[PDB]
Amino acid sequence: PKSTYFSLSDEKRNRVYDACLNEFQTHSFHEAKIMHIVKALDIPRGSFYQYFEDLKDAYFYVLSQETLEIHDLFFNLLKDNSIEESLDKYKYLLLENLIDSPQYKLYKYRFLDWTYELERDWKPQSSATVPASENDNPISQVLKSVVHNLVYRLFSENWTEKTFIENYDKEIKLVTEGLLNYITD
Amino acid sequence: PKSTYFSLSDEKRNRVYDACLNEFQTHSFHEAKIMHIVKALDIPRGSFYQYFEDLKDAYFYVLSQETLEIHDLFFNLLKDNSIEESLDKYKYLLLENLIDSPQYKLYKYRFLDWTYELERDWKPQSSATVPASENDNPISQVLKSVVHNLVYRLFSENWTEKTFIENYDKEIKLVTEGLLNYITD
Ligand code: HEM
Ligand code: HEM
Numbered sequence: 479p480k481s482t483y484f485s486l487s488d489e490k491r492n493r494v495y496d497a498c499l500n501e502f503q504t505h506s507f508h509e510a511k512i513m514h515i516v517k518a519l520d521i522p523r524g525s526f527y528q529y530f531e532d533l534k535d536a537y538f539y540v541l542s543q544e545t546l547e548i549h550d551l552f553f554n555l556l557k558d559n560s561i562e563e564s565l566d567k568y569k570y571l572l573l574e575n576l577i578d579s580p581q582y583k584l585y586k587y588r589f590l591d592w593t594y595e596l597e598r599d600w601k602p603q604s605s606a607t608v609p610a611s612e613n614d615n616p617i618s619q620v621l622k623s624v625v626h627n628l629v630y631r632l633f634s635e636n637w638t639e640k641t642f643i644e645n646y647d648k649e650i651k652l653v654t655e656g657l658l659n660y661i662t663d
Numbered sequence: 664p665k666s667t668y669f670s671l672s673d674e675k676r677n678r679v680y681d682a683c684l685n686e687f688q689t690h691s692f693h694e695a696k697i698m699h700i701v702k703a704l705d706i707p708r709g710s711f712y713q714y715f716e717d718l719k720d721a722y723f724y725v726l727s728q729e730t731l732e733i734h735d736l737f738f739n740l741l742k743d744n745s746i747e748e749s750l751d752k753y754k755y756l757l758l759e760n761l762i763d764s765p766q767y768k769l770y771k772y773r774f775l776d777w778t779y780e781l782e783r784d785w786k787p788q789s790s791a792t793v794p795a796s797e798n799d800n801p802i803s804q805v806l807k808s809v810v811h812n813l814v815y816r817l818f819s820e821n822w823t824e825k826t827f828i829e830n831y832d833k834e835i836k837l838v839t840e841g842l843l844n845y846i847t848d
């Protein structure tokens with residue numbers, strides 16, 4: 479977003495952010511409209527462009543902020559828990575913060591309704607949403623792959639909560655024990 | 664594709680398939696054109712529609728056939744190798760059949776240039792490209808996740824071959840030993 483967005487008071491900036499978040503919880507990016515957001519906020523359309531270059535700007539900003547949060551939900555556990563137990567705890571933070579949440583829809587669109595055009599503009603502008611050390615390491619890449627995939631399938635196959643828990647457990651156990659041990663047992 | 668495509672002689676059907684494959688090795692789906700394929704084959708445009716409903720039909724068919732092959736490259740090893748060693752061998756089949764191949768471009772577009780519109784039409788029409796038992800199991804889901812992710816990054820970050828091998832090894836070892844053992848060692 480633009481400097482004027484960041485120079486808003488906490489209360490005003492948080493209101494603007496909430497309206498942008500709410501638009502993206504209820505519409506895919508292709509369906510989202512600047513007009514919806516300004517009518518929610520009851521501000522002239524012009525005001526929107528003082529905060530953001532365009533819709534994409536707001537979308538990327540919302541994505542970056544919510545993803546940072548959903549990631550921190552996991553990465554914060556590693557300060558006070560084994561990776562094993564952090565993963566088991568994260569399962570339930572996901573129930574509360576992803577499945578039973580308005581973010582369910584935000585993430586379904588991100589996962590299913592992405593495009594090369596979005597990726598093209600997203601990737602070069604993006605700041606890390608994971609810890610600085612935690613991008614370059616094999617542990618994060620493996621857990622990313624497997625957990626993102628469970629989330630993708632949750633959306634894709636419209637899993638119930640119990641089906642999500644069942645597969646997460648099976649697959650995170652396989653990751654934890656390894657392929658060799660899972661095979662022996 | 665339509666019945667008339669399948670009723671072609673092996674030689675004629677294989678020629679048509681090669682031209683469709685070649686169009687998709689050199690263009691993203693959005694950039695691909697029926698006109699390119701028929702000019703390659705030197706047949707009237709009308710002939711194309713006797714073989715396929717539309718471009719999407721040919722694209723999906725090509726994708727399904729090449730993916731079946733790239734998957735079988737792995738799954739065929741499991742008849743004659745430990746899963747551990749099959750994975751290590753697969754790394755090199757990927758060098759020969761993905762990186763140094765015309766399929767590099769076919770797969771880059773599939774990985775990076777997909778859309779909800781494509782997925783919407785793809786998913787319900789798709790037949791399995793993996794063994795019947797091998798869709799419903801946690802091993803396949805974990806290996807899918809991790810290997811697809813290595814492939815995504817290969818394309819995304821334009822990895823050299825050596826960088827692909829380095830990360831594959833690190834990450835497939837972590838999968839094989841497990842997170843616990845990788846941490847201990
Ligand atoms: C243990 C849990 C997770 C880990 C370790 C993890 C890890 C990562 C990593 C490392 C990246 C950056 C990829 C790179 O730059 O190489 C990433 C990106 C991202 N993650 Fe996660 N993730 C986890 C769970 C989730 C969940 C539950 C969601 C959403 C429901 C999510 C959504 C995203 C999104 C939207 C991105 C942006 C780029 C992309 O799609 O890859 N992640 N994640
Ligand atoms: C050990 C290696 C691999 C395994 C076990 C694997 C497994 C799978 C599985 C199980 C599916 C179907 C997902 C489902 O229906 O739940 C799938 C789909 C697919 N795979 Fe792979 N895969 C591997 C490697 C590759 C590679 C190297 C490529 C291409 C370069 C690839 C490309 C695809 C494509 C294009 C699909 C179509 C749907 C999708 O994108 O998920 N796979 N794979």
Ligand SMILES: C[As](C)(=O)[O-]
Nearest residue numbers: 491492493495543
């Ligand atoms: C500090 As904010 C997530 O309201 O822009």
Ligand SMILES: C[As](C)(=O)[O-]
Nearest residue numbers: 676677678680728
């Ligand atoms: C049998 As075929 C892959 O040429 O349609």
